[PDB]
Design a protein around this ligand. Structure first.
Ligand SMILES: *[C@@](C)(CO)[C@](*)(O)[C@H](Cc1ccccc1)NC(=O)[C@H](Cc1ccc(OC)cc1)NC(=O)[C@H](C)NC(=O)C1=CC2=CCC=CC2=C1C
Ligand SMILES: [Mg+2]
Lengths: 235, 233, 240, 211, 244, 222, 231, 195
């Protein structure tokens, strides 16, 4: 056939490029970074009404100061999360401190290119890693299966990404509040989702310095959806 | 873990104003038997370093080969091997010190005590000790085995501290080393009359003296000594 | 060792070997899982192409992983034994290191992790098996029902079916199963499970297996006659 | 050392001394022999200080990972067992550790004794170290389930004092802890020199000593 | 490199089948028919040797029926060489169980072990599967008399009566017709031979073209005897049942 | 039989001030009754405003310092030039020591610097990695000579206020850098008098927010 | 064509296509410039962003106090290679108490990249590196290609549109080599060199990345408002 | 640990095991249960070096429970005792052997018979009507030799066991803090809460 670590004539790794196509098929995940915190939101996308939607866990805690959202082949993410959690806690063991968000992200990305003929293929999932540390403050990273990671003020991944990213281009500014960011994620999720957005098929979360990483209740999100509807009807 | 078989005794050394001196006798002992009388225990590395070794001779010969190989390896893909990127005394020492400590950590030591004497690029004097345990130290004077007990006291009368080094000439330093070697011949039962001496100067370079002998020895007073107390005849 | 990467991405972003493993599941006999208010029922199809079978000794479709958790499947039979064995070992290993039995969610997560590992490991092919894992957590009266699949994704279900003609029985369950009021009793839960299989099975004789799991390690398999009574009552109400 | 811990109606008391010795030389006057694994978990230290610190700080890593994986606090029973299994890997290698894993979980308050041999014991009351015999004397005669938080804190404090006095390898100060269902609560560092004289006068005990 | 020449023996087809398993089954369909029939008082194993010669030494020959232990035997259909590899492994597993628990291995446990080995060759290793299908005839004190079959897929099932190898479709129909639950060994012997006599590709069924075995409680009091039939004994049972 | 360990003597001393910290040690290196060197540095500036000294078996001490210095280097590489705090360094050293739980670094280790609030800090280790933050600590050959003196003259132990007769303690007033250096010099001068492995010289490293400063003082050479 | 499936296959004209394809990844990468005098050595790198919300990917990596590099191509491969250099620089210090020569560092990178071009299963590195440093023989600049070829130069540039900066340096050769004891003027020449490779976009405050090493100057990186001086 | 006794009567097996656990010179616990249920009708008591005892017992327990689930069937006491013996015989030539002595009491539901097996740390197995480990047999076997009948009731077996414990309490130098008694019969395993 052909090697798994083969370069294309354009200078790209075939397998890495193909894994990016799998991520485009995944459910939407959005992250917005502000000076009051970072918000993470996802589309749950249940395949059937009999599937209990609260069991869909696409937002995940890595540490008290680091959260993570996923998009693509979500089964691949479990070992990445396991490594991330281990790295975060192991550093706390060795250095008696919280680990930097960038350093955590870098540790996750070091797994990415460990494939060949190590694992047999790259990961088929992208991660939005959001967190806070004392040195660089509130941060949002986009971790790909290429091993590359970019920091973002705001970022969308998944099937509705380029449409959402264009929207985030216009809406984001450096003075956004946390409440404003929450509504903004809900707004853009509602825009790119197939089914009608509600508290059961979408999920919010945030990371603040005070309270740390929190996944929002369905009752809490429902109120933010109702607040969104009214403010859009206001003009 | 082993025991030393064929052994070499004291190696002594000191700093002076423009460089360093090092010396060691030419004997290879087999316990109390003075088996081998033509053993060179000072080994030059380039024209700026001399490594003096005491202890097990088979391990000495091993180290001698590591050094010979080190020079070979440094020349590889190195246009400045006889100039800027030549081996320094500090490089050679740290290498040996690394090996000695690793070997003791595997419980299979090189049963030696080594003194690396040389002059650096910037003209600074280098003199440092290392042994089978990987223990390292530096001082204006350094000596191994018996030399530590007998030679250091004599050499420290010349250079007692760092500020005495510029005041010490090469003639004075050599004189002190040669006297120390005579004292060791009087008092060390595993020493020999024949020895080698090396001077590494920042101006005149490396001078390697072989086939030296202890001379001007005092024995005449022995004729008057009779018995062990009460005997007169 | 044999290191060849068998599960790989294709230009369109698909892992064909994982998708072809789902086709093996589609070929497998139908399995269904329904959870009531205080129980979970696991139904399983037995294809009647094989008669002269010895039903005493033939491997049953539902397998106990521990005293409080069961596992049924659809797909390659030989593959399912490997997952079941690994699951059973992990169940005893968890009891041994943590002093509590596994939660149904944990056991599912482990089995799904095994399936995932076989999609990005060299020299191996994915498991041609999807599973339904059901039971009750220790000292808990809330029913648990989970599904896994070759890719390694897993999720919880109020009711779910897998295997051949699972599209049809899922259609039935989606219109018949009310979340606000689930099957209150064991009878209602079994009746709904048999009804759902009768949409696909053919004859209601030895083709339907039912296994009821209640809280506190109360697991029993219904017999032919007991199931046959459900089959009789359903069709007599249907003649109207 | 002397350490103790006991369950009672209002949770569990944990009291330790603070002395560290290197032979007959008192190397440390004030050493922390309690580890704060999590808000609801404590660990005592007796034996080799290095072994106690390393392995219990490593247990806290494993307990934290448990919370991340399961979204739920580890039980005292499970925590104690992880630690005993660590000791079992270095079976006969020369580790010296004697600890009590104290906490509150879903079964209520929990207390487990764990040592370098791999021994893991559940119980209401334990005491470890060179002065454990002196502490057990006070504990056994005065312990009740019906103790008040104030009286229980004193009992553990007084029990360490008894040992600090008689045992030459116990002393320095007393560190107190009280574990509730809202977590552990530190009840201060108490110098034995000052505490001894105070208790002597107020209680009337230690009559044989002059002051 | 070496990838160029790799057949990839452990992959799915687009339809979700294992290529090599399916082709191995095709191989087995050309092998001599083997039949197993379970009765209330014993089990019968009958099998047809493939186009033999007059110069073949039959009395010292064994290609179909093999002994795993005193309680369990197997009939083979496929590559004999492949079967012997597996048979020797099974014999060892039985002895390991006996050494460990001091009890004879239950039939199903032995069957599952062999079937798990076959399964392994279909999922990992990159090697071709074993081109063998077994009929297991055995007894233990839990389930009594038992018949099982396993194939290259590693899947196994229990049976009252079953055939493997050539013409199983025809053979299974004939067995399904004449088999009854209250049947006895002597009757099952007759059924097995009659079925082979009708499904055989040969002109006539003779003693030299057959291997035969029974597992009976027809052993003095509560115990089980294995009988591998000799050439002369197969010749006698053929006359008794009225085939020759 | 081969003995992989040795004793190079020496003695070290760390004292934590209110906004500073000192780590002192003699410069004498010995084996048995011989002097190897009268000036062999033992206290090192390890970077990030941290000073360190591993006293006991010099070969193991030099290796540990070398490895920690290396650990600081890789901490910068791996974590975007972040400053290694004194508490983080301490925990890192614990793990370096425990790597050899079954073939220990035969050294008593002390480090000194400033905590993240700018206050003075001293951390003390045993050979197998037990550590703890302290205000005052002497280590090595003459540790038992010096510590009691520091209990008395730094923490005012057994000292009470005149007139009250044991009722009121001496209040714990803070010490200046000039006052600390006096106590350090007297500690080593006293140790030199009664311990044969202590002498020749005294090198003190002082740590403040401004950086790391050195001071050297002669000791008796007998 | 038929001979580009793996790195273990020569074409009929003696070419290694997988290596050539890895070389192509460098050309797609953002431009970076290297140049030196007798006292100092400078790296200048144009950083690239994903979009306006994203950060600008870092291009320069520190290897030791006296050595570092800039990258162009697959960033993860640069991390692997720079990590290797860090270890080799570090092995030289710990064992020999010797700062690793820049020339020897190049020889080590060459040999590491080569092994990936001759063996089955692996792949070539997909990144180009510009290594600067100051050792016992003064200032140095190296160019690394993942074919294995390492070249010591006075100045150079790699990445997209790198030919413009390379021509400029070829003209300015006699001028910038003489810039001794003046770090700011040497950086100016580097900033003016990389400017010859720009189209549409210009050098902004979070776009530009500069690094320097010299006689009494440790390897330091300048980003953010620290490079506003040179815009 | 110290004392573990066992007696097989007409229709059951009775195991008695001491409650004490000692570290150094102090008795840490006086209510320790030195036993594990391997299966519903099989019980194993144990005594030996600290730590090893429980690990080994729990390791055996896990293996038998795994077998039970896999086959949906309870192994005979004889089969279990043979498995345990093999693990110990395997262990004795290991780098670091497990220093554990056991008694296995079980009721064979097939044969409808109680069975008692005694196995020491070397892997020395013997089926007995009554057994013990360590020094316990030195004091008790004389009484059992005298009073034991195979047709004894469970109540008679407990009375004879009380007599054995009374003799141990009189002539043993060590205080073992009484015993926990458990009965194994057709109906399963139960503990005698008053003894
Ligand atoms: C009580 C004081 C009994 O002596 C009590 O057990 C304390 C407990 C404790 C717990 C947590 C922190 C501090 C103290 N035990 C000690 O202080 C302990 C007693 C002990 C000493 C030595 C060993 O063997 C190593 C076991 C127990 N003391 C120490 O751990 C002291 C700090 N260790 C050493 O002095 C020591 C010297 C030494 C030389 C070479 C290798 C290791 C060495 C150690 C640990
Ligand atoms: Mg002195």
């Amino acid at each position: 056939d052909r090697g798994v670590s083969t370069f294309s004539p354009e200078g790209r790794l075939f397998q890495v490029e193909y894994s990016l196509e799998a991520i485009k098929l995944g459910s939407t995940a959005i992250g917005i970074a502000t000076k009051e915190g970072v918000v993470l939101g996802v589309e749950k996308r249940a395949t059937s009404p009999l599937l209990e939607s609260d069991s869909i866990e696409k937002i995940v805690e890595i540490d008290r100061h680091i959260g993570c959202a996923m998009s693509g082949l979500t089964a691949d993410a479990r070992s990445m999360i396991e490594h991330a959690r281990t790295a975060a806690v192991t550093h706390n063991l060795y250095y008696d401190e919280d680990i930097n968000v960038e350093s955590l992200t870098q540790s996750v990305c070091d797994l990415a290119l460990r494939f060949g003929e190590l694992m047999s293929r790259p990961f088929g999932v992208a991660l939005l890693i959001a967190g806070h540390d004392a040195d660089d403050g509130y941060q949002l990273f986009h971790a790909e299966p290429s091993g590359t990671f970019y920091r973002y003020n705001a970022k969308a991944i998944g099937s509705g990404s380029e449409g959402a990213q264009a929207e985030l281009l216009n809406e984001w500014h450096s003075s956004l509040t946390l409440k404003e960011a929450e509504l903004l994620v809900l707004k853009i999720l509602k825009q790119v989702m197939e089914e009608k957005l509600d508290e059961n098929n979408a999920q919010l979360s945030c990371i603040t310095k005070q309270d740390g990483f929190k996944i929002y209740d369905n009752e809490k999100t429902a109120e933010l959806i109702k607040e969104l509807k009214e403010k859009e009807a206001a003009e | 873990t082993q025991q030393p078989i064929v052994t070499g005794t004291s190696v002594i050394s000191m700093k002076y104003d423009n460089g360093v001196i090092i010396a060691a006798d030419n004997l290879g002992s087999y316990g109390s038997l003075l088996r081998f009388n033509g053993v060179e225990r000072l080994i030059p590395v380039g024209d700026n370093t001399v490594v003096g070794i005491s202890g097990d001779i088979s391990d000495m010969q091993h180290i001698e080969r590591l050094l010979k190989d080190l020079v070979t390896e440094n020349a590889y893909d190195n246009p400045l091997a006889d100039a800027e990127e030549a081996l320094e005394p500090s490089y050679i020492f740290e290498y040996l010190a690394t090996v000695m400590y690793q070997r003791r950590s595997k419980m299979n030591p090189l049963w030696n005590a080594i003194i690396v004497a040389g002059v650096q690029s910037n003209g600074d004097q280098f003199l440092r000790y290392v042994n089978l345990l990987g223990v390292t130290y530096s001082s204006p004077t350094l000596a191994t085995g018996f030399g530590a007990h007998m030679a250091n006291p004599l050499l420290r009368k010349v250079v007692d501290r760092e500020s005495d080094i510029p005041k010490t000439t090469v003639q004075v330093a050599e004189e002190a080393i040669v006297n120390a070697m005579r004292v060791l011949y009087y008092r060390d039962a595993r020493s020999s009359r024949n020895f080698s001496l090396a001077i590494i100067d920042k101006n005149t370079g490396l001078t390697f003296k072989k086939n030296l002998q202890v001379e001007n020895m005092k024995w005449d007073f022995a004729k008057d000594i009779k018995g062990y107390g009460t005997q007169k005849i | 060792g044999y290191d060849r990467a068998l599960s790989i991405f294709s230009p369109d972003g698909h892992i064909f070997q994982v998708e072809y493993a789902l086709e093996a599941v589609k070929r497998g006999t139908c399995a269904v899982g329904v959870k009531g208010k205080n129980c979970v029922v696991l139904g399983c199809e037995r294809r009647s192409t094989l008669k002269l079978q010895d039903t005493r000794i033939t491997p049953s479709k539902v397998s106990k992983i521990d005293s409080h958790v069961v596992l049924s499947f659809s797909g390659l039979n030989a593959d399912s034994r490997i997952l079941i064995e690994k699951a059973r070992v992990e169940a005893q290993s968890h009891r041994l290191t943590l002093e509590d039995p596994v939660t149904v969610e944990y056991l599912t997560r482990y089995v799904a992790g095994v399936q995932q590992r076989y999609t990005q490991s060299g020299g191996v092919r994915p498991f041609g098996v999807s599973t339904l894992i059901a039971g009750f957590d220790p000292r808990d009266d809330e029913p648990k029902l989970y599904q896994t699949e070759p890719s390694g994704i897993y999720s919880s279900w109020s009711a779910q079916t897998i295997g051949r003609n699972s599209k049809t029985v899922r259609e039935f369950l989606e219109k018949n199963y009310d979340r606000k009021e689930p099957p209150a009793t064991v009878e209602e839960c079994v009746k709904l499970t048999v009804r759902s299989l009768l949409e696909v099975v053919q004859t209601g004789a030895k083709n339907i297996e039912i296994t009821v799991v209640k809280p506190d390690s109360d697991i029993v398999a219904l017999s032919s006659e007991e199931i046959n009574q459900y089959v009789t009552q359903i069709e007599q109400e249907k003649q109207e | 050392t002397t350490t103790l811990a006991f369950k009672f109606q209002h949770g569990v008391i944990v009291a330790v001394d603070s002395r560290a010795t290197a032979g007959s030389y008192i190397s440390s006057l004030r050493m922390n022999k309690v580890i704060e694994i999590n808000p609801y978990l404590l660990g005592t230290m007796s034996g080799c200080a290095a072994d106690c610190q390393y392995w219990e700080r490593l247990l806290a890593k494993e307990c934290r990972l448990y919370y991340l994986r399961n979204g739920e606090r580890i039980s005292v029973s499970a925590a104690s067992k992880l630690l005993s299994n660590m000791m079992l890997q270095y079976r006969g290698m020369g580790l010296s550790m004697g600890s009590m894993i104290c906490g509150w979980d879903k079964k209520g308050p929990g207390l487990y004794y764990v040592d370098d041999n791999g021994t893991r014991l559940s119980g209401q009351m334990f005491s470890t170290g060179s002065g454990n015999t002196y502490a057990y004397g006070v504990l056994d005669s005065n312990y009740k389930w019906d103790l008040s938080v104030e009286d229980a804190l004193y009992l553990g404090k007084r029990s360490i004092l008894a040992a600090a006095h008689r045992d030459a390898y116990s002393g320095g100060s007393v560190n107190l802890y009280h574990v509730t269902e809202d977590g552990w609560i530190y009840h201060g560092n108490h110098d034995v020199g000052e505490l001894f004289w105070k208790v002597k006068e107020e209680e009337g005990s230690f009559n044989n000593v002059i002051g | 490199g070496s990838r160029r020449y790799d057949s990839r023996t452990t992959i799915f087809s687009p339809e979700g089948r294992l290529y090599q398993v399916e082709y191995a089954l095709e191989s087995i369909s050309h092998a001599g028919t083997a039949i197993g029939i379970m009765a209330s008082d014993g089990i019968v194993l009958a099998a047809e040797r493939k186009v033999t010669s007059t110069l073949l030494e039959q009395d010292t020959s064994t290609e179909k029926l093999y002994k795993l232990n005193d309680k369990i035997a197997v009939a083979v259909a496929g590559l004999t060489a492949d079967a012997e590899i597996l048979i020797n492994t099974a014999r060892i597993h039985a002895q390991n169980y006996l050494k460990t628990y001091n009890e004879d291995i239950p039939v199903e446990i032995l069957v599952r072990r062999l079937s798990d080995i076959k399964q392994g060759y279909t999922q990992h290793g990159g090697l071709r599967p074993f081109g063998v299908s077994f009929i297991y005839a055995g007894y233990d004190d839990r389930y009594g008399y038992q018949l099982y079959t396993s194939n290259p897929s590693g899947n196994y099932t229990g049976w009252k009566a079953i055939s493997v190898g050539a013409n199983t479709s025809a053979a299974q129909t004939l067995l399904q017709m004449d088999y009854k639950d209250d049947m006895k060994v002597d009757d099952a012997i007759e059924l097995a031979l009659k079925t082979l006599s009708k499904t055989t590709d040969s002109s006539a069924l003779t003693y030299d073209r057959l291997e035969f075995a029974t597992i009976r409680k027809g052993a003095n009091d509560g115990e089980v005897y294995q009988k591998i039939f000799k050439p002369q004994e197969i010749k006698d049972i053929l006359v008794k049942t009225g085939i020759t | 039989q081969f003995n992989p360990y040795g004793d190079n003597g020496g003695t070290i001393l760390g004292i934590a001030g209110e906004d500073f910290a000192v780590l002192a040690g003699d410069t004498r290196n010995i084996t048995d009754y011989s002097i190897n060197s009268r000036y062999e540095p033992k206290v090192f500036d390890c970077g990030d405003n941290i000073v360190m000294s591993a006293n006991g078996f010099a070969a193991d001490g030099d290796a540990l310092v070398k490895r920690f210095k290396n650990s600081v280097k890789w901490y910068h590489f791996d974590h975007n030039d972040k400053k290694l705090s004194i508490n983080s360094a301490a925990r890192n050293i614990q793990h370096l020591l425990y790597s050899r739980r079954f073939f220990p670094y035969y050294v008593y280790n002390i480090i000194a610097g400033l905590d993240e609030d700018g206050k003075g800090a001293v951390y003390s280790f045993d050979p197998v990695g037990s550590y703890q933050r302290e205000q005052c600590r002497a280590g090595g050959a003459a540790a038992s000579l010096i510590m009691p003196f520091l209990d008395n003259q730094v923490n005012f132990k057994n000292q009470y206020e005149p007139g009250t007769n044991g009722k009121v303690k001496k209040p714990l007033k803070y010490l200046s850098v000039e006052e600390v250096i006096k106590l350090v010099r007297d500690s080593f001068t006293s140790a030199t008098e009664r311990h044969i492995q202590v002498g020749d010289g005294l090198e003190i490293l002082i740590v403040t927010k401004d950086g790391v400063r050195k001071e050297f003082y002669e000791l008796k050479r007998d | 064509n038929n001979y580009d499936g793996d790195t273990v296959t020569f074409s009929p004209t003696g070419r290694l296509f997988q290596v050539e394809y890895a070389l192509e990844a460098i050309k797609q990468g953002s431009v970076t410039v290297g140049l030196r005098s007798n006292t100092h050595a400078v790296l200048v790198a144009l950083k690239r962003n994903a979009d306006e919300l994203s950060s600008y990917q870092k291009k320069i990596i520190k290897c030791d106090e006296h050595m570092g590099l800039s990258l162009a191509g697959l960033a993860p491969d640069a991390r692997v290679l720079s990590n290797y250099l860090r270890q080799q620089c570090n092995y030289s210090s710990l064992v020999f108490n010797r700062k690793l020569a820049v020339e020897r560092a190049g020889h080590l990178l060459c040999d590491k990249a080569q092994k990936n071009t001759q063996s089955y299963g692996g792949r070539p590195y997909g990144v180009g590196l510009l290594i600067i440093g100051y050792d016992k023989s003064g200032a140095h600049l190296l160019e690394f290609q993942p074919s294995g070829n390492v070249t010591e130069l006075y100045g150079t540039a790699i990445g997209a549109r790198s030919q413009g900066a390379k021509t400029y340096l070829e003209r300015t050769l006699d001028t910038f080599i003489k810039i001794d004891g003046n770090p700011d003027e040497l950086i100016k020449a580097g900033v003016e060199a990389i400017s010859q490779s720009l189209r549409d976009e210009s050098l902004t405050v979070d776009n530009l990345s500069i690094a320097i090493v010299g006689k009494d100057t440790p390897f330091t990186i300048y980003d953010g408002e620290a490079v506003a001086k040179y815009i | 640990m110290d004392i573990i006794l066992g007696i097989r009567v007409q229709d059951s097996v009775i195991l008695a095991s001491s409650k004490a656990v000692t570290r150094g010179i102090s008795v840490l616990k006086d209510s320790d249960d030195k036993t594990r249920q391997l299966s519903p009708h099989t019980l194993m008591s144990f005594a030996g070096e600290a730590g090893d005892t429980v690990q080994f017992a729990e390791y055996i327990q896990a293996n038998i429970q795994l077998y039970s689930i896999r086959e949906d069937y309870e192994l005979s006491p004889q089969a279990v005792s043979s498995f345990v013996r093999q693990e110990l015989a395997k262990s004795i030539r290991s780098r670091r052997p497990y220093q554990v002595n056991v008694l296995i009491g079980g009721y064979d539901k097939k044969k409808n018979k109680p069975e008692l097996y005694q196995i020491d740390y070397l892997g020395t197995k013997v089926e007995l009507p009554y057994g013990a480990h360590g020094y316990s047999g030195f004091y008790t076997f004389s009484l059992l030799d005298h009073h034991y009948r195979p047709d004894m009731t469970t109540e008679e077996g407990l009375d004879l066991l009380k007599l054995c414990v009374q003799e141990l309490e009189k002539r043993m130098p060590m205080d073992f803090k009484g015993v926990i008694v458990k009965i194994v019969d057709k109906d399963g395993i139960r503990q005698v809460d008053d003894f």
